[PDB]
PDB file of C-alpha atoms and ligand atoms in Angstrom:
ATOM      1  CA  UNK A 768       0.000   0.000   0.000  1.00 30.82           C
ATOM      2  CA  UNK A 769       3.127   2.245   0.239  1.00 36.79           C
ATOM      3  CA  UNK A 770       3.811   3.150  -3.407  1.00 35.33           C
ATOM      4  CA  UNK A 771       7.263   4.604  -4.305  1.00 35.22           C
ATOM      5  CA  UNK A 772       7.489   8.417  -4.542  1.00 36.35           C
ATOM      6  CA  UNK A 773       9.426   8.133  -7.805  1.00 36.74           C
ATOM      7  CA  UNK A 774       8.525   5.026  -9.857  1.00 39.20           C
ATOM      8  CA  UNK A 775      10.859   5.932 -12.755  1.00 39.62           C
ATOM      9  CA  UNK A 776      13.800   5.531 -10.351  1.00 38.64           C
ATOM     10  CA  UNK A 777      12.642   2.129  -9.072  1.00 39.99           C
ATOM     11  CA  UNK A 778      15.357   0.497 -11.244  1.00 39.22           C
ATOM     12  CA  UNK A 779      18.989   0.250 -10.141  1.00 38.71           C
ATOM     13  CA  UNK A 780      20.342   1.225 -13.584  1.00 38.73           C
ATOM     14  CA  UNK A 781      17.892   4.129 -13.806  1.00 37.98           C
ATOM     15  CA  UNK A 782      19.642   5.392 -10.670  1.00 40.01           C
ATOM     16  CA  UNK A 783      23.328   4.780 -11.567  1.00 38.38           C
ATOM     17  CA  UNK A 784      22.659   6.688 -14.801  1.00 39.50           C
ATOM     18  CA  UNK A 785      22.021   9.808 -12.728  1.00 39.77           C
ATOM     19  CA  UNK A 786      25.637   9.570 -11.509  1.00 38.92           C
ATOM     20  CA  UNK A 787      27.262  10.549 -14.833  1.00 38.91           C
ATOM     21  CA  UNK A 788      28.866  13.702 -13.479  1.00 37.82           C
ATOM     22  CA  UNK A 789      29.707  12.221 -10.068  1.00 38.33           C
ATOM     23  CA  UNK A 790      32.802  13.860  -8.584  1.00 35.87           C
ATOM     24  CA  UNK A 791      32.337  12.971  -4.887  1.00 31.50           C
ATOM     25  CA  UNK A 792      34.253  10.486  -2.716  1.00 29.47           C
ATOM     26  CA  UNK A 793      31.124   8.555  -1.683  1.00 31.47           C
ATOM     27  CA  UNK A 794      30.660   5.559  -3.971  1.00 30.44           C
ATOM     28  CA  UNK A 795      28.119   5.797  -6.804  1.00 29.51           C
ATOM     29  CA  UNK A 796      27.398   2.027  -6.732  1.00 27.50           C
ATOM     30  CA  UNK A 797      26.610   2.084  -2.993  1.00 26.04           C
ATOM     31  CA  UNK A 798      24.375   5.148  -3.311  1.00 27.93           C
ATOM     32  CA  UNK A 799      22.290   3.613  -6.093  1.00 29.08           C
ATOM     33  CA  UNK A 800      22.050   0.257  -4.317  1.00 31.14           C
ATOM     34  CA  UNK A 801      20.799   2.119  -1.236  1.00 31.01           C
ATOM     35  CA  UNK A 802      17.934   3.620  -3.285  1.00 30.27           C
ATOM     36  CA  UNK A 803      19.473   7.044  -3.908  1.00 31.21           C
ATOM     37  CA  UNK A 804      19.733   8.897  -7.189  1.00 31.48           C
ATOM     38  CA  UNK A 805      21.672  12.140  -7.714  1.00 31.52           C
ATOM     39  CA  UNK A 806      19.844  15.407  -8.379  1.00 32.59           C
ATOM     40  CA  UNK A 807      22.438  17.047 -10.650  1.00 32.06           C
ATOM     41  CA  UNK A 808      22.897  19.546  -7.851  1.00 31.85           C
ATOM     42  CA  UNK A 809      25.598  19.647  -5.147  1.00 33.43           C
ATOM     43  CA  UNK A 810      25.935  16.130  -3.744  1.00 32.74           C
ATOM     44  CA  UNK A 811      22.168  16.173  -3.121  1.00 35.25           C
ATOM     45  CA  UNK A 812      20.582  12.717  -3.452  1.00 33.21           C
ATOM     46  CA  UNK A 813      17.015  11.473  -2.967  1.00 31.65           C
ATOM     47  CA  UNK A 814      15.550   8.026  -2.239  1.00 31.55           C
ATOM     48  CA  UNK A 815      13.269   6.838  -5.038  1.00 32.40           C
ATOM     49  CA  UNK A 816      10.936   5.200  -2.552  1.00 35.18           C
ATOM     50  CA  UNK A 817      10.566   7.327   0.612  1.00 34.10           C
ATOM     51  CA  UNK A 818      11.784  10.526  -1.068  1.00 34.62           C
ATOM     52  CA  UNK A 819      14.344  11.209   1.667  1.00 36.86           C
ATOM     53  CA  UNK A 820      17.008  13.767   0.746  1.00 34.12           C
ATOM     54  CA  UNK A 821      20.672  13.709   1.825  1.00 31.47           C
ATOM     55  CA  UNK A 822      23.667  16.025   1.317  1.00 31.94           C
ATOM     56  CA  UNK A 823      27.104  16.971   2.657  1.00 32.73           C
ATOM     57  CA  UNK A 824      28.487  13.417   2.516  1.00 34.86           C
ATOM     58  CA  UNK A 825      31.588  12.798   4.604  1.00 35.98           C
ATOM     59  CA  UNK A 826      34.576  10.679   3.385  1.00 33.67           C
ATOM     60  CA  UNK A 827      33.660   7.498   5.278  1.00 34.06           C
ATOM     61  CA  UNK A 828      29.856   7.477   5.474  1.00 35.07           C
ATOM     62  CA  UNK A 829      27.702   4.476   4.578  1.00 35.18           C
ATOM     63  CA  UNK A 830      24.675   5.239   2.317  1.00 35.77           C
ATOM     64  CA  UNK A 831      22.732   2.428   3.981  1.00 32.47           C
ATOM     65  CA  UNK A 832      23.503   3.618   7.516  1.00 31.27           C
ATOM     66  CA  UNK A 833      22.629   7.215   6.614  1.00 32.27           C
ATOM     67  CA  UNK A 834      19.404   6.087   4.938  1.00 27.76           C
ATOM     68  CA  UNK A 835      18.338   4.293   8.121  1.00 27.35           C
ATOM     69  CA  UNK A 836      19.613   7.018  10.438  1.00 25.09           C
ATOM     70  CA  UNK A 837      17.579   9.724   8.761  1.00 24.22           C
ATOM     71  CA  UNK A 838      14.667   7.882   7.146  1.00 27.53           C
ATOM     72  CA  UNK A 839      13.943   4.704   9.108  1.00 27.69           C
ATOM     73  CA  UNK A 840      10.388   4.599   7.734  1.00 25.21           C
ATOM     74  CA  UNK A 841      11.426   3.666   4.158  1.00 27.61           C
ATOM     75  CA  UNK A 842       9.754   0.504   2.806  1.00 29.65           C
ATOM     76  CA  UNK A 843      12.563  -0.114   0.313  1.00 29.73           C
ATOM     77  CA  UNK A 844      15.139   0.104   3.112  1.00 30.32           C
ATOM     78  CA  UNK A 845      13.090  -2.330   5.207  1.00 29.47           C
ATOM     79  CA  UNK A 846      12.854  -4.925   2.402  1.00 31.20           C
ATOM     80  CA  UNK A 847      16.565  -4.726   1.568  1.00 34.47           C
ATOM     81  CA  UNK A 848      18.002  -4.578   5.112  1.00 31.07           C
ATOM     82  CA  UNK A 849      15.226  -5.849   7.425  1.00 30.40           C
ATOM     83  CA  UNK A 850      13.987  -4.665  10.820  1.00 31.45           C
ATOM     84  CA  UNK A 851      17.108  -5.540  12.809  1.00 31.16           C
ATOM     85  CA  UNK A 852      19.447  -3.388  10.756  1.00 31.93           C
ATOM     86  CA  UNK A 853      17.144  -0.366  11.054  1.00 30.49           C
ATOM     87  CA  UNK A 854      16.414  -0.752  14.754  1.00 29.56           C
ATOM     88  CA  UNK A 855      20.126  -1.216  15.425  1.00 33.12           C
ATOM     89  CA  UNK A 856      21.072   2.141  13.910  1.00 33.07           C
ATOM     90  CA  UNK A 857      18.494   3.795  16.152  1.00 29.01           C
ATOM     91  CA  UNK A 858      19.296   1.731  19.266  1.00 27.39           C
ATOM     92  CA  UNK A 859      22.918   2.834  18.870  1.00 26.92           C
ATOM     93  CA  UNK A 860      22.038   6.544  18.701  1.00 26.84           C
ATOM     94  CA  UNK A 861      19.924   6.368  21.868  1.00 28.84           C
ATOM     95  CA  UNK A 862      22.515   4.335  23.815  1.00 30.17           C
ATOM     96  CA  UNK A 863      25.271   6.711  22.821  1.00 31.76           C
ATOM     97  CA  UNK A 864      23.244   9.816  23.882  1.00 32.83           C
ATOM     98  CA  UNK A 865      22.339   8.009  27.085  1.00 30.48           C
ATOM     99  CA  UNK A 866      25.996   7.177  27.852  1.00 29.37           C
ATOM    100  CA  UNK A 867      27.293  10.703  27.209  1.00 28.12           C
ATOM    101  CA  UNK A 868      24.517  13.233  28.013  1.00 27.10           C
TER     102      UNK A 868
ATOM    103  CA  UNK B1246      37.811 -23.677  13.661  1.00 25.27           C
ATOM    104  CA  UNK B1247      34.284 -23.674  15.179  1.00 23.42           C
ATOM    105  CA  UNK B1248      33.261 -27.322  14.764  1.00 26.31           C
ATOM    106  CA  UNK B1249      29.817 -28.090  16.289  1.00 26.48           C
ATOM    107  CA  UNK B1250      30.129 -29.352  19.876  1.00 24.48           C
ATOM    108  CA  UNK B1251      27.606 -32.158  19.502  1.00 25.39           C
ATOM    109  CA  UNK B1252      27.841 -33.239  15.836  1.00 25.70           C
ATOM    110  CA  UNK B1253      25.136 -35.918  16.287  1.00 25.41           C
ATOM    111  CA  UNK B1254      22.429 -33.360  17.149  1.00 26.17           C
ATOM    112  CA  UNK B1255      23.110 -31.254  14.032  1.00 28.26           C
ATOM    113  CA  UNK B1256      19.948 -32.437  12.220  1.00 29.57           C
ATOM    114  CA  UNK B1257      16.645 -30.842  13.243  1.00 33.77           C
ATOM    115  CA  UNK B1258      15.159 -34.376  13.201  1.00 34.31           C
ATOM    116  CA  UNK B1259      17.576 -35.562  15.899  1.00 34.18           C
ATOM    117  CA  UNK B1260      16.657 -32.643  18.168  1.00 38.15           C
ATOM    118  CA  UNK B1261      12.830 -32.793  17.961  1.00 37.92           C
ATOM    119  CA  UNK B1262      12.796 -36.464  18.996  1.00 36.14           C
ATOM    120  CA  UNK B1263      14.649 -35.516  22.209  1.00 36.56           C
ATOM    121  CA  UNK B1264      11.432 -33.804  23.336  1.00 38.89           C
ATOM    122  CA  UNK B1265       8.260 -35.770  22.427  1.00 38.89           C
ATOM    123  CA  UNK B1266       7.567 -36.314  26.108  1.00 41.55           C
ATOM    124  CA  UNK B1267       7.742 -32.566  27.004  1.00 42.50           C
ATOM    125  CA  UNK B1268       5.610 -30.943  29.751  1.00 43.29           C
ATOM    126  CA  UNK B1269       6.806 -27.289  29.837  1.00 41.47           C
ATOM    127  CA  UNK B1270       5.465 -23.800  29.051  1.00 39.30           C
ATOM    128  CA  UNK B1271       7.895 -23.220  26.154  1.00 40.85           C
ATOM    129  CA  UNK B1272       7.209 -24.368  22.587  1.00 39.94           C
ATOM    130  CA  UNK B1273       9.333 -27.428  21.675  1.00 37.61           C
ATOM    131  CA  UNK B1274       9.073 -26.682  17.950  1.00 37.71           C
ATOM    132  CA  UNK B1275      10.994 -23.394  18.360  1.00 36.71           C
ATOM    133  CA  UNK B1276      13.579 -24.742  20.819  1.00 35.92           C
ATOM    134  CA  UNK B1277      14.629 -27.344  18.238  1.00 39.92           C
ATOM    135  CA  UNK B1278      14.703 -24.789  15.397  1.00 36.87           C
ATOM    136  CA  UNK B1279      16.898 -22.618  17.667  1.00 35.98           C
ATOM    137  CA  UNK B1280      19.486 -25.406  17.941  1.00 39.10           C
ATOM    138  CA  UNK B1281      18.442 -26.815  21.324  1.00 40.30           C
ATOM    139  CA  UNK B1282      17.672 -30.343  22.509  1.00 42.05           C
ATOM    140  CA  UNK B1283      16.249 -31.567  25.838  1.00 42.72           C
ATOM    141  CA  UNK B1284      18.260 -33.509  28.398  1.00 45.10           C
ATOM    142  CA  UNK B1285      15.257 -35.413  29.814  1.00 45.06           C
ATOM    143  CA  UNK B1286      16.227 -33.696  33.057  1.00 44.44           C
ATOM    144  CA  UNK B1287      14.059 -30.779  34.237  1.00 40.69           C
ATOM    145  CA  UNK B1288      13.351 -28.238  31.493  1.00 42.56           C
ATOM    146  CA  UNK B1289      17.092 -28.200  30.719  1.00 42.69           C
ATOM    147  CA  UNK B1290      18.146 -27.761  27.076  1.00 45.46           C
ATOM    148  CA  UNK B1291      21.523 -27.471  25.316  1.00 49.58           C
ATOM    149  CA  UNK B1292      22.589 -25.995  21.956  1.00 49.48           C
ATOM    150  CA  UNK B1293      24.206 -28.583  19.635  1.00 46.19           C
ATOM    151  CA  UNK B1294      26.803 -26.185  18.235  1.00 45.83           C
ATOM    152  CA  UNK B1295      27.985 -24.035  21.148  1.00 46.61           C
ATOM    153  CA  UNK B1296      26.959 -26.292  24.052  1.00 45.57           C
ATOM    154  CA  UNK B1297      25.136 -23.454  25.807  1.00 45.84           C
ATOM    155  CA  UNK B1298      22.644 -24.757  28.348  1.00 43.71           C
ATOM    156  CA  UNK B1299      19.403 -23.051  29.358  1.00 43.05           C
ATOM    157  CA  UNK B1300      16.880 -23.796  32.120  1.00 43.29           C
ATOM    158  CA  UNK B1301      13.885 -22.371  34.011  1.00 43.45           C
ATOM    159  CA  UNK B1302      11.836 -21.253  31.003  1.00 43.18           C
ATOM    160  CA  UNK B1303       9.141 -18.664  31.715  1.00 41.70           C
ATOM    161  CA  UNK B1304       5.696 -18.623  29.923  1.00 41.90           C
ATOM    162  CA  UNK B1305       6.647 -16.403  26.972  1.00 39.61           C
ATOM    163  CA  UNK B1306      10.413 -16.414  26.421  1.00 38.77           C
ATOM    164  CA  UNK B1307      11.782 -16.710  22.885  1.00 37.09           C
ATOM    165  CA  UNK B1308      14.340 -19.545  22.302  1.00 35.58           C
ATOM    166  CA  UNK B1309      16.234 -17.422  19.768  1.00 36.17           C
ATOM    167  CA  UNK B1310      16.238 -14.302  21.982  1.00 37.23           C
ATOM    168  CA  UNK B1311      17.392 -16.311  24.971  1.00 37.10           C
ATOM    169  CA  UNK B1312      20.101 -17.976  22.865  1.00 36.04           C
ATOM    170  CA  UNK B1313      21.440 -14.584  21.778  1.00 34.26           C
ATOM    171  CA  UNK B1314      21.032 -13.089  25.253  1.00 34.86           C
ATOM    172  CA  UNK B1315      23.148 -15.750  26.949  1.00 34.85           C
ATOM    173  CA  UNK B1316      25.382 -17.184  24.246  1.00 36.69           C
ATOM    174  CA  UNK B1317      25.996 -14.426  21.710  1.00 32.50           C
ATOM    175  CA  UNK B1318      29.108 -16.127  20.302  1.00 33.86           C
ATOM    176  CA  UNK B1319      27.417 -19.189  18.783  1.00 32.32           C
ATOM    177  CA  UNK B1320      28.279 -19.814  15.101  1.00 33.17           C
ATOM    178  CA  UNK B1321      24.976 -21.544  14.331  1.00 28.75           C
ATOM    179  CA  UNK B1322      23.091 -18.561  15.793  1.00 26.63           C
ATOM    180  CA  UNK B1323      25.126 -16.202  13.602  1.00 26.09           C
ATOM    181  CA  UNK B1324      24.532 -18.210  10.419  1.00 25.71           C
ATOM    182  CA  UNK B1325      20.798 -18.530  11.211  1.00 26.57           C
ATOM    183  CA  UNK B1326      19.930 -15.106  12.598  1.00 24.12           C
ATOM    184  CA  UNK B1327      22.833 -12.863  11.492  1.00 24.45           C
ATOM    185  CA  UNK B1328      24.942 -10.080  13.032  1.00 26.07           C
ATOM    186  CA  UNK B1329      22.167  -7.515  13.409  1.00 27.01           C
ATOM    187  CA  UNK B1330      19.806  -9.728  15.391  1.00 27.09           C
ATOM    188  CA  UNK B1331      22.549 -10.672  17.912  1.00 24.20           C
ATOM    189  CA  UNK B1332      23.882  -7.140  18.463  1.00 24.87           C
ATOM    190  CA  UNK B1333      20.291  -5.987  18.547  1.00 26.39           C
ATOM    191  CA  UNK B1334      19.536  -8.119  21.630  1.00 31.26           C
ATOM    192  CA  UNK B1335      22.635  -6.866  23.440  1.00 28.62           C
ATOM    193  CA  UNK B1336      22.171  -3.212  22.507  1.00 30.44           C
ATOM    194  CA  UNK B1337      18.697  -3.276  24.006  1.00 31.74           C
ATOM    195  CA  UNK B1338      20.150  -4.662  27.242  1.00 31.32           C
ATOM    196  CA  UNK B1339      22.832  -1.952  27.321  1.00 29.49           C
ATOM    197  CA  UNK B1340      20.355   0.824  26.513  1.00 28.60           C
ATOM    198  CA  UNK B1341      17.878  -0.428  29.100  1.00 29.12           C
ATOM    199  CA  UNK B1342      20.424  -0.737  31.971  1.00 30.39           C
ATOM    200  CA  UNK B1343      21.959   2.586  31.068  1.00 30.35           C
ATOM    201  CA  UNK B1344      18.501   4.250  31.012  1.00 31.10           C
ATOM    202  CA  UNK B1345      17.200   2.947  34.367  1.00 32.85           C
ATOM    203  CA  UNK B1346      18.646   5.128  37.202  1.00 30.86           C
TER     204      UNK B1346
HETATM  205  C1  SMK C2610      24.218  12.065   4.512  1.00 30.45           C
HETATM  206  C2  SMK C2610      25.364  12.255   5.496  1.00 30.45           C
HETATM  207  C3  SMK C2610      25.582  13.739   5.789  1.00 30.45           C
HETATM  208  N1  SMK C2610      26.820  13.930   6.558  1.00 30.45           N
HETATM  209  C4  SMK C2610      24.386  14.249   6.577  1.00 30.45           C
HETATM  210  O1  SMK C2610      24.100  13.792   7.680  1.00 30.45           O
HETATM  211  N2  SMK C2610      23.682  15.195   5.989  1.00 30.45           N
HETATM  212  C5  SMK C2610      22.498  15.717   6.679  1.00 30.45           C
HETATM  213  C6  SMK C2610      21.306  15.785   5.701  1.00 30.45           C
HETATM  214  O2  SMK C2610      21.492  15.526   4.514  1.00 30.45           O
HETATM  215  N3  SMK C2610      20.063  16.063   6.082  1.00 30.45           N
HETATM  216  C7  SMK C2610      19.598  16.388   7.437  1.00 30.45           C
HETATM  217  C8  SMK C2610      20.309  17.673   7.868  1.00 30.45           C
HETATM  218  C9  SMK C2610      21.686  17.374   8.485  1.00 30.45           C
HETATM  219  C10 SMK C2610      22.809  17.018   7.472  1.00 30.45           C
HETATM  220  C11 SMK C2610      23.200  18.225   6.603  1.00 30.45           C
HETATM  221  C12 SMK C2610      24.214  19.124   7.329  1.00 30.45           C
HETATM  222  N4  SMK C2610      25.567  18.566   7.194  1.00 30.45           N
HETATM  223  C13 SMK C2610      18.100  16.657   7.317  1.00 30.45           C
HETATM  224  C14 SMK C2610      17.692  16.023   5.993  1.00 30.45           C
HETATM  225  C15 SMK C2610      18.951  16.092   5.128  1.00 30.45           C
HETATM  226  C16 SMK C2610      19.005  17.373   4.287  1.00 30.45           C
HETATM  227  O3  SMK C2610      19.530  18.401   4.708  1.00 30.45           O
HETATM  228  N5  SMK C2610      18.455  17.264   3.086  1.00 30.45           N
HETATM  229  C17 SMK C2610      18.439  18.387   2.142  1.00 30.45           C
HETATM  230  C18 SMK C2610      18.122  17.835   0.754  1.00 30.45           C
HETATM  231  C19 SMK C2610      17.024  18.275   0.020  1.00 30.45           C
HETATM  232  C20 SMK C2610      16.789  17.740  -1.242  1.00 30.45           C
HETATM  233  C21 SMK C2610      17.644  16.767  -1.760  1.00 30.45           C
HETATM  234  C22 SMK C2610      18.744  16.321  -1.029  1.00 30.45           C
HETATM  235  C23 SMK C2610      18.974  16.863   0.230  1.00 30.45           C
HETATM  236  C24 SMK C2610      17.477  19.492   2.608  1.00 30.45           C
HETATM  237  C25 SMK C2610      17.788  20.824   2.319  1.00 30.45           C
HETATM  238  C26 SMK C2610      16.945  21.856   2.732  1.00 30.45           C
HETATM  239  C27 SMK C2610      15.788  21.548   3.445  1.00 30.45           C
HETATM  240  C28 SMK C2610      15.476  20.220   3.740  1.00 30.45           C
HETATM  241  C29 SMK C2610      16.319  19.187   3.327  1.00 30.45           C
HETATM  242  C1  SMK C2611      16.165 -19.660  29.216  1.00 28.82           C
HETATM  243  C2  SMK C2611      15.258 -18.600  29.826  1.00 28.82           C
HETATM  244  C3  SMK C2611      15.298 -18.683  31.353  1.00 28.82           C
HETATM  245  N1  SMK C2611      14.274 -17.801  31.936  1.00 28.82           N
HETATM  246  C4  SMK C2611      16.673 -18.244  31.833  1.00 28.82           C
HETATM  247  O1  SMK C2611      17.062 -17.091  31.660  1.00 28.82           O
HETATM  248  N2  SMK C2611      17.392 -19.177  32.432  1.00 28.82           N
HETATM  249  C5  SMK C2611      18.732 -18.834  32.906  1.00 28.82           C
HETATM  250  C6  SMK C2611      19.729 -19.925  32.488  1.00 28.82           C
HETATM  251  O2  SMK C2611      19.314 -20.952  31.957  1.00 28.82           O
HETATM  252  N3  SMK C2611      21.044 -19.796  32.648  1.00 28.82           N
HETATM  253  C7  SMK C2611      21.764 -18.660  33.259  1.00 28.82           C
HETATM  254  C8  SMK C2611      21.340 -18.557  34.734  1.00 28.82           C
HETATM  255  C9  SMK C2611      20.015 -17.786  34.884  1.00 28.82           C
HETATM  256  C10 SMK C2611      18.734 -18.529  34.423  1.00 28.82           C
HETATM  257  C11 SMK C2611      18.464 -19.742  35.325  1.00 28.82           C
HETATM  258  C12 SMK C2611      17.613 -19.352  36.543  1.00 28.82           C
HETATM  259  N4  SMK C2611      16.663 -18.293  36.165  1.00 28.82           N
HETATM  260  C13 SMK C2611      23.251 -19.001  33.169  1.00 28.82           C
HETATM  261  C14 SMK C2611      23.344 -20.170  32.189  1.00 28.82           C
HETATM  262  C15 SMK C2611      21.976 -20.853  32.244  1.00 28.82           C
HETATM  263  C16 SMK C2611      21.916 -21.970  33.303  1.00 28.82           C
HETATM  264  O3  SMK C2611      21.468 -21.768  34.433  1.00 28.82           O
HETATM  265  N5  SMK C2611      22.357 -23.148  32.897  1.00 28.82           N
HETATM  266  C17 SMK C2611      22.333 -24.326  33.771  1.00 28.82           C
HETATM  267  C18 SMK C2611      22.317 -25.548  32.864  1.00 28.82           C
HETATM  268  C19 SMK C2611      23.224 -26.597  33.015  1.00 28.82           C
HETATM  269  C20 SMK C2611      23.153 -27.690  32.153  1.00 28.82           C
HETATM  270  C21 SMK C2611      22.185 -27.731  31.146  1.00 28.82           C
HETATM  271  C22 SMK C2611      21.279 -26.682  30.996  1.00 28.82           C
HETATM  272  C23 SMK C2611      21.347 -25.588  31.858  1.00 28.82           C
HETATM  273  C24 SMK C2611      23.495 -24.322  34.781  1.00 28.82           C
HETATM  274  C25 SMK C2611      23.247 -24.734  36.091  1.00 28.82           C
HETATM  275  C26 SMK C2611      24.272 -24.736  37.034  1.00 28.82           C
HETATM  276  C27 SMK C2611      25.552 -24.321  36.670  1.00 28.82           C
HETATM  277  C28 SMK C2611      25.804 -23.906  35.363  1.00 28.82           C
HETATM  278  C29 SMK C2611      24.775 -23.906  34.419  1.00 28.82           C
HETATM  279 ZN1   ZN C2612      14.102   5.477   1.377  1.00 31.34          ZN
HETATM  280 ZN1   ZN C2613      24.361 -22.011  20.300  1.00 30.46          ZN
END
C-alpha cells in the first residue's frame, strides 16, 4: 500500500545513470544500491521510494547507515536490510546519547 | 575452527525427537529450530553447536532471543539469525540498563 514516490527511479540502472557527473568520494554504486539517485545539484541525493534527501556526505559514510539514520520509515530500506538493521542504527544513537549526556 | 560441539544433534530431526515427552510452558518446535535439545532432566536444554545450556523457562520467552542473550558467540546462531539480530539483543540490554537510574 506504500507506493514509491518516484517510480521511474525504481530500477537500479535508472539510478546509476544519474551519476554521470559524479565527482564525490562517496561511492556511486553504494548510493544507487541504497535507493538514492543524484539530483544534478551539489551532492544532493534522494531516495526513489521514501523521497528522503541527503547532502554533505563525509569521506567514510555508509549510504545504507545514513538512509536508516535519517529515514527509518522507508519501505525499500526495510525490504533490503530488514527490521534488525534499522532498529540497530536507532538503538545505537539512543545508547550513545544516554551514555554521554 | 568452530566445529559443532555435539555433531550428532546437528539435524533438526535428531533434536525434535529428544522432546516428544515434554511438559513445559515453552514451545518445543521453536527450541529445536533454535538449535536446542532436551536432556530429559528438568526443562534443561543445550545448543548442539555451542553447548550453551538453558533452564527455568518462563511462559513467553523466545528460544532465539534467549540464545542470543546468553550465548551471543554461537556460530549456528550467527549463520541462522545474522549479526544484526545478535547485536540488537545486546544493545537493548545496554540501553535499558543505562537508562534505568
Ligand atoms: C548524509 C550524510 C551527511 N553527513 C548528513 O548527515 N547530511 C544531513 C542531511 O542531509 N540532512 C539532514 C540535515 C543534516 C545534514 C546536513 C548538514 N551537514 C536533514 C535532511 C537532510 C538534508 O539536509 N536534506 C536536504 C536535501 C534536500 C533535497 C535533496 C537532497 C537533500 C534538505 C535541504 C533543505 C531543506 C530540507 C532538506
Ligand atoms: C532460558 C530462559 C530462562 N528464563 C533463563 O534465563 N534461564 C537462565 C539460564 O538458563 N542460565 C543462566 C542462569 C540464569 C537462568 C536460570 C535461573 N533463572 C546461566 C546459564 C543458564 C543456566 O542456568 N544453565 C544451567 C544448565 C546446566 C546444564 C544444562 C542446561 C542448563 C546451569 C546450572 C548450574 C551451573 C551452570 C549452568
Ligand atoms: Zn528510502
Ligand atoms: Zn548455540
